[PDB]
Request: fold
Amino acid sequence: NAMTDTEQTRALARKYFDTLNGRAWEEFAALLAEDVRYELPQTSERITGRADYLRFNQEYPGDWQLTVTRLLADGPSAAVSVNLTLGDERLVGVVFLEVVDGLVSRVTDFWPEAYEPPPGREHLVERVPAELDRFG
Amino acid sequence: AMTDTEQTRALARKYFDTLNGRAWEEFAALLAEDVRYELPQTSERITGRADYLRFNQEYPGDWQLTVTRLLADGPSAAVSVNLTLGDERLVGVVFLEVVDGLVSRVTDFWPEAYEPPPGREHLVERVPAELDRFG
Reply:
């Protein structure tokens, strides 16, 4: 009958992405800590508090879609990669979650984008689309 | 062992310690002979222990890595690192897959710093991340 911290986090991370992708705002808000802290390190942005974070998601323009590609859970921590279609762009997200008392306490979002590789390793690389992660 | 988790945690830790320490024989030894490295952002793939070792050894600059998060989950790991290279500060996120106590798959992401799109100024604070160090 006893669920480990890890399995609780796994279930919660799954629900976070399912309710987010479904724009199921009441259910999404209910899994966030009142003092949830969101960071986008790439842009040096932070959002604090469930109210502001919910608004940020609700006010977000365009028609986006995510599909979870990896989901790791380890104690209170999750790391999740997603394929994102953001408008016309194919993107990847890597999101770190921290869970406290069965609620999402921290969200740290990374949104890596395609880039041209630096020269010097042509002899070691094969150029081919990645197996799971979609930039095209 | 009921799960591979703690074995994966140690292996992921050693992968980064030896890589950062340029301890090449120890680093090579924890790679599968058939290790596959991917950089999905650049659509690059490197296959095999020899070529992957070579990629790491030939990489230029006085790079230094510090692990900021390390999650282990059965045979999988997710690790974030702060990389310093000259004046530049970059962040890596790496997914590892383990087969037979060796690193079998490595998937690197190097998300680049960018300027945020307008429209959320009233909801966001402009402040550097707690753990993740960009220039």
Residues 5-21 of chain A form the longest helix (17 residues). Chain A touches chain B through 50 residues (CB under 8 Å).
